[PDB]
Enzyme design. Structure first.
Site, short mmCIF file in Angstrom:
data_model
loop_
_atom_site.label_atom_id
_atom_site.label_comp_id
_atom_site.label_asym_id
_atom_site.label_seq_id
_atom_site.Cartn_x
_atom_site.Cartn_y
_atom_site.Cartn_z
N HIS A 83 0.84 -1.20 0.00
CA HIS A 83 0.00 0.00 0.00
C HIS A 83 0.88 1.26 0.00
CE1 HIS A 83 0.18 -0.31 4.52
NE2 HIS A 83 -0.12 0.98 4.52
N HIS A 85 1.54 3.85 2.02
CA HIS A 85 2.23 4.39 3.21
C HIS A 85 3.77 4.14 3.27
CE1 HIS A 85 -1.83 4.32 5.66
NE2 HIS A 85 -1.72 5.38 4.90
N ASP A 87 5.97 2.84 5.43
CA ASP A 87 6.49 1.53 5.83
C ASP A 87 6.49 0.55 4.68
OD1 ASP A 87 3.66 1.95 6.28
OD2 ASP A 87 3.55 0.30 7.70
N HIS A 148 -7.25 -1.52 5.84
CA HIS A 148 -6.36 -0.51 6.43
C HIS A 148 -6.21 0.71 5.52
CE1 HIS A 148 -2.63 1.15 8.15
NE2 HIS A 148 -2.16 1.11 6.92
N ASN A 179 -3.53 2.84 13.32
CA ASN A 179 -3.76 4.05 12.53
C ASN A 179 -4.83 3.82 11.49
OD1 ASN A 179 -3.69 6.33 10.82
ND2 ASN A 179 -1.85 5.58 9.76
ZN ZN Z 1 -0.37 1.92 6.33
ZN ZN Z 2 1.99 0.20 8.86
#
Ligand code: ZN
Ligand code: ZN
Length: 230
Positions: A83, A85, A87, A148, A179
């Protein structure tokens, strides 16, 4: 057994062997004044390796490459980010400069660009609808629906019955969904149900953060997200 935050300092990466030719990579990163561990995956494909997710940062990702060379001795030739993000895509520039071909869905690439994150080079088509599944080297990529994030992918290694859930899946010790700023809490349990239905033979389930376990990580995740939403 499986490393935790206390055992990995930021900048160091450990590998953990899950099955023949399947490893997780574990890194630690400081975010918003907290240190967290993060997992990704490494899968053997002949004499090359497929990497799933960066190690959360340019320095961590360089450390990751160095650790793979030391422990495994085979070149990483392709990477997929599950995804948009950091990380997951932070470090893509390091991979690309190292000669690794980086991939993500068109949706992940667009969201990463919009957020100012690094952008994988190549688009993965055929993943735009919930339930879509595509083969990619030694793995199957699956789009379970929004969880998520709206773009989150999961990865199955058929040879090993290993399911890597990324952040669509939470570890068993988790009491919250973490989150959720980009999450779809209403859809998430349904998306997990799709995973359960499509991969009932999974023996190991690896969350985006924390300890691997069995298929119960899936139901647990649905339960936590449902309880989160209240
Ligand atoms: Zn994420
Ligand atoms: Zn994460």
């Amino acid at each position: 057994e499986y490393p935790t935050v206390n055992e990995i300092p930021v900048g160091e990466v450990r590998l953990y062997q899950i099955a023949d030719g399947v490893w997780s990579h574990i890194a630690t990163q400081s975010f918003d004044g907290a240190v967290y561990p993060s997992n990704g995956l490494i899968v053997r494909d002949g004499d090359e390796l497929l990497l799933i997710d960066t190690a959360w940062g340019a320095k961590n990702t360089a450390a990751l490459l160095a650790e793979i060379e030391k422990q495994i001795g085979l070149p990483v030739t392709r990477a997929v980010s599950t995804h948009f993000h950091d990380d997951r895509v932070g470090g893509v520039d390091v991979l690309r400069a190292a000669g690794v071909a980086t991939y993500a869905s068109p949706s992940t690439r667009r969201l990463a660009e919009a957020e100012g994150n690094e952008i994988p080079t190549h688009s993965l088509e055929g993943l735009s609808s919930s339930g879509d599944a595509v083969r990619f080297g030694p793995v199957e990529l699956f789009y379970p629906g929004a969880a998520h994030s709206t773009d989150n992918l999961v990865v199955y290694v058929p040879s090993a019955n290993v399911l890597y859930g990324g952040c669509a899946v939470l570890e068993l010790s988790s009491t919250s969904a973490g989150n959720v700023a980009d999450a779809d809490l209403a859809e998430w349990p349904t998306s997990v149900e799709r995973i359960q239905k499509h991969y009932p033979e999974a023996e190991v389930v690896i969350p985006g953060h924390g300890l691997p376990g069995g298929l119960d990580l899936l139901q647990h995740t649905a339960n936590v997200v449902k309880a989160h939403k209240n």
